[PDB]
Amino acid sequence: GFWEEFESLQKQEVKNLHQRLEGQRPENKGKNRYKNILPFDHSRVILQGRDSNIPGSDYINANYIKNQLLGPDENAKTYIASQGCLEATVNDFWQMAWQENSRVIVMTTREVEKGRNKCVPYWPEVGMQRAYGPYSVTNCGEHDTTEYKLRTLQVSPLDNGDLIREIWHYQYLSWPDHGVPSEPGGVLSFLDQINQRQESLPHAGPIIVHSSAGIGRTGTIIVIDMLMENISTKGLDCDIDIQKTIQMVRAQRSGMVQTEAQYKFIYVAIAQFIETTKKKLE
């Protein structure tokens, strides 16, 4: 039944046409990994502090994503869905993180996979400090396992060292591009850490989630996280509509959730989360 449902979603996405003119500007061509994967103008992240007389200076391939299915009365985490950095966009990424007050970054790709570049590194090595445009980033600690890396970063503007912000960077290592993890437990545990971290930081800005293209692993993991939050806050019997949730996130960034197997993985992950949650009750 999953194939039929994903086909329907893909058919709808064909008609999901909205202006993407900023991403199409020639001066922004080196800021995109794929000419056809671009942020909608209406929901794109606009970089602040730039000179409006430098064409394209405000551009990054990323969109705000919120759970638009929730009512006014409902608390929920919000996100940015972003492309993975190219060398030319590392500084842009840090301007985005700074201006949005993001305290948690979720990277769902390795830097290079099977010889294909996916995302250049945009952090210093452990115990080191790097400048990225007007910002200093220091890697103050790193916990690596075979499944994920957690880096604790300290970020400050070069012109105000007294303003230091701790940012937690979570990198999942076992989710290949265009594919799915072998089992859902790793992603669920990873998200549990991420959710707890964000919940511990009142006033944190949106969680930045990225992959390589910023749509497949990014879209899938955002949808999983949104549905986990529904289950955690609303309860085990909350209405879960994965197709509707995907359509809603695709209204905000094109092509979110790239493959039928990723679509299925959302169901499998959420089913496991429900079972774990039910067993924790009794």
Curated annotation (Swiss-Prot):
Glycyl lysine isopeptide (Lys-Gly) (interchain with G-Cter in ubiquitin) cross-link site: K66
Main location as per UniProt: cytoplasm
Active-site residue numbers: S211 (phosphocysteine intermediate)
Localization, UniProt: Cytoplasm; Nucleus
Tissue specificity of this protein: Isoform 1 is expressed in hematopoietic cells. Isoform 2 is expressed in non-hematopoietic cells.
UniProt: substrate binding residues: D177, S211, S212, A213, G214, I215, G216, R217, Q258
Phenotypic consequence of K66R: Almost complete loss of ubiquitination by ITCH and WWP2
Tagged with keyword Repeat: yes
Keyword DNA-binding in record: no
Gene Ontology terms: cellular component: alpha-beta T cell receptor complex; cell-cell junction; cytoplasm; cytosol; extracellular exosome; extracellular region; membrane; nucleolus
Oligomeric and partner information: Monomer. Interacts with MTUS1. Interacts with MILR1 (tyrosine-phosphorylated). Interacts with KIT. Interacts with SIRPA/PTPNS1. Interacts with LILRB1 and LILRB2. Interacts with LILRB4. Interacts with FCRL2 and FCRL4. Interacts with FCRL3 and FCRL6 (tyrosine phosphorylated form). Interacts with CD84. Interacts with CD300LF. Interacts with CDK2. Interacts with KIR2DL1; the interaction is enhanced by ARRB2. Interacts (via SH2 1 domain) with ROS1; the interaction is direct and promotes ROS1 dephosphorylation. Interacts with EGFR; inhibits EGFR-dependent activation of MAPK/ERK. (Microbial infection) Interacts with HIV-1 Vif; this interaction promotes the suppression of cytokine production.
Name of the protein in question: Tyrosine-protein phosphatase non-receptor type 6
Organism whose genome encodes this protein: Homo sapiens (Human)
Gene expressing this chain: PTPN6
